[model samples]
Target: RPSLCDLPADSGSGTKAEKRIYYNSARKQCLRFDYTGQGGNENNFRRTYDCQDTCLYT
Candidate 1:
């Protein structure tokens, strides 16, 4: 399993551990941060970007 440090700092790594713990302490945060807002509003629901393949290109 991955840890809070696995994600990038600019992508909101600081609060990741807290949020993950709030959800589940068994594992680290599985969500990755995408500041592009490609999906939609992240305030009310969970938003995930589909750039896993394209991320390496940029």
Candidate 2:
């Protein structure tokens, strides 16, 4: 199984766009992106805090 924080950002594809964040394992950082509000993976986070809380704390 793939670790969530290690997965690449998948903004997904949909009609709606949402400001979101994802964990970058290579960069070891939390980056923001425009999420299309659909089909996003577990790496996608609604908040930077959430991203840090998940990835950083791991």
Candidate 3:
């Protein structure tokens, strides 16, 4: 299974901001809110995970 970070930032090609949804091997549904930071710094950008994992894995 691909890590949350490994998932594509945008679907259907291109780098435009878009909602990319996916599911993990553990049957956890996830959505990536792809967006650029105030200054276009990816490091400054935020990536949120919405899974229900009680234990930390990877």
Candidate 4:
């Protein structure tokens, strides 16, 4: 996961958005929010488990 999880959650930039999850390394928690599915970063995950696997497990 590197340091990507430590960065802030990206909401993306596009007309289409979906419910996405991002890791909050500072808080050591996963946050769920709307994702535009564009211009996103590695910290973006489409599901809870993915975020958990990338952030929580570490």
Output the better candidate (2/4) by lDDT: 2
lDDT of 2 by residue, 1-58 (tens): 2488888788787878899998888787889888888988889888999899889777
Give per-residue lDDT, candidate 4, residue 11.
Answer: 79
For residue 26, model 4's alpha carbon misses the true position, in angstroms, by 2.0
Query: lDDT of candidate 2?
Result: 0.84
Model 4 regions lying over 4 Å from their true place: none
Worst 10 residues of 4 by lDDT: 1-10
Instruction: Name the lDDT of candidate 4.
Output: 0.83
Q: Residue by residue across 1-58, what tens digits does model 3's lDDT show?
A: 3244333333333455644333333434354444422323221113234232311244
What are the Cα lDDT values of the candidates? 0.27, 0.84, 0.34, 0.83
RMSD of candidate 4 to the truth, in angstroms, is 1.3
Q: Distance from true position, residue 51, model 2, in Å?
A: 0.6
Clashes of 2: 0
Clashing pairs in 3: none
lDDT per residue as tens, model 1, 1-58: 2232233323242323322111122333224433332322222113223222222212
Q: Which one is best on TM-score?
A: 2
Comparison by lDDT, 1 against 4, better one = 4
Give the winner by lDDT.
2
For candidate 3, what is the lDDT? 0.34
